[PDB]
């Protein structure tokens, strides 16, 4: 519920933020979340404040179970029942990690409907399954949720993202009608393939570039440098020694090319991360520590268990370095 | 001519240095 986002001073993934909700989130997020989180230094147990915030974020993420109680069930602090319930609780974890809403949409499914595992229905809603478990819908589930997963993987990863990243900054009441139009276009199973083949090539190039940005963040250029340590020195050798050889002892165009390519060497191997970015969209992080689906008809046998650094945390590495004291 | 190119190397390299220096001076704002 949005009220919970208001309490958490931020955004707990309410769906379909109506207009005044847009207003109130901008207000709350910026003003409050800044002012508190920006520059306070309170004795107000900021450690324990953080603790409350994280132990309150996580339960909605996994629906509504109390996770302090999960902590308490064992005598440890954390990270073990975490890696465990995420190894599987079998509806809230896997069905959402692939294709659903972890909430009582993906719940009650195992209650009444079926997702037979190894053709075996396991209708307990909290199972733990690992190391060789075939996850399969029923057929009367398939004949609808094939279409549902298609309209998900496209309307909610192509359409919404594409009306995002663009058409955006001045007016959203306009991305509204643009979503209307692109809905009319996605109504079409030929438009599908044409879009597969459309100018999204350009956007993927720009995305490669922005990943290169977030890469150069922390030394990709430094390792490029070390890996091509000679080559720049070789260019400098060209320049300086052809100088002290040809003259002052084609020269002008030797200097032309040497200057150009050498200065360009130094530029490309020392441009330090002009970020200045407007916003940042988010990727969908598919699990390939678990095995994929026959996305045609759901048959998504697992092959392994999860790690801790590749999980959809809506929390930065901090406060989860306070919960999961991990490297 | 080659002395013009040597001072040209000094010119372009100090130019690049100062440009990236101001670039970082601006990136330190955010």
């Amino acid at each position: 519920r949005f009220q919970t986002c208001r309490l958490l001073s931020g955004n707990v993934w309410n769906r379909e933020l109506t207009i005044i909700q847009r207003r109130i989130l901008r207000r709350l997020r910026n003003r409050k979340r800044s002012i508190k989180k920006r520059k306070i230094y309170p004795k107000k147990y900021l450690t324990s404040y953080i603790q409350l915030q994280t132990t309150r974020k996580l339960p909605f993420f996994y629906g509504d179970l109390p996770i302090t109680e999960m902590h308490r069930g064992t005598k440890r602090t954390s990270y073990i029942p975490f890696l465990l319930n995420l190894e599987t609780r079998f509806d809230v974890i896997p069905l959402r990690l692939y294709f659903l809403e972890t909430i009582p949409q993906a719940r009650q499914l195992i209650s009444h409907r079926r997702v037979c595992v190894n053709k075996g229905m396991v209708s307990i809603t909290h199972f733990k399954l690992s190391h060789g478990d075939i996850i399969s819908f029923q057929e009367n589930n398939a004949i609808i949720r094939g279409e549902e997963i298609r309209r998900s993987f496209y309307k909610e990863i192509l359409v919404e993202k594409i009306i995002g990243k663009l058409l955006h900054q001045p007016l959203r009441m306009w991305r509204r009608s643009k979503t209307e139009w692109f809905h009319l276009l996605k109504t079409k199973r030929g438009c599908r393939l044409l879009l597969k083949s459309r100018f999204l090539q350009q956007l993927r190039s720009s995305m490669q570039e922005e990943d290169l940005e977030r890469t150069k963040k922390f030394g990709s250029e430094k390792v490029c440098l070390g890996s091509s340590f000679a080559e720049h020195k070789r260019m400098k050798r060209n320049l300086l020694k052809s100088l002290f050889l040809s003259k002052r002892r084609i020269s002008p165009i030797v200097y032309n090319s040497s200057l150009s390519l050498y200065s360009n060497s130094t530029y490309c191997f020392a441009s330090p991360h002009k970020l200045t970015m407007k916003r940042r969209i988010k990727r969908i992080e598919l699990p390939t520590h678990y095995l994929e689906v026959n996305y045609r008809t759901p048959k998504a046998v697992v092959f392994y268990g999860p790690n801790i650094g590749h999980i959809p945390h809506d929390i930065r590495l901090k406060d989860l370095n306070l919960l999961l004291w991990s490297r | 001519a080659a002395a013009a190119a040597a001072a040209a190397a000094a010119a372009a390299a100090a130019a690049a240095a100062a440009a990236a220096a101001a670039a970082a001076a601006a990136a330190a704002a955010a």
Binding site: L212, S220, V223, C224, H232, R234, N238, S257, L261, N264 | -
Partner: protein, 68 residues
């Protein structure tokens, strides 16, 4: 003429934007002890073809070390 050889190899380096990206993939591989790819499912149906036809040579060592 050594000088124009030099300018050719300096151009070679100048056009080496891609080295940034091989370094991208190799440091990602550094990060978790993993490999930076998807297999794109063309390789997956391709390896199913390969092994289905050749369940004699294409062991799950040959195959799985091919596709890593």
């Amino acid at each position: 003429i050594e000088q124009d050889n030099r300018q050719g190899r300096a151009f070679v380096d100048g056009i080496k934007q891609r080295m940034m990206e091989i370094s991208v993939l190799l440091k990602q591989v550094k990060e978790p002890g993993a490999r930076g790819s998807y297999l794109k499912d063309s390789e997956k149906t391709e390896m199913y073809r390969l092994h289905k036809e050749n369940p004699e040579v294409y062991t799950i060592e040959r195959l799985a070390k091919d596709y890593r």
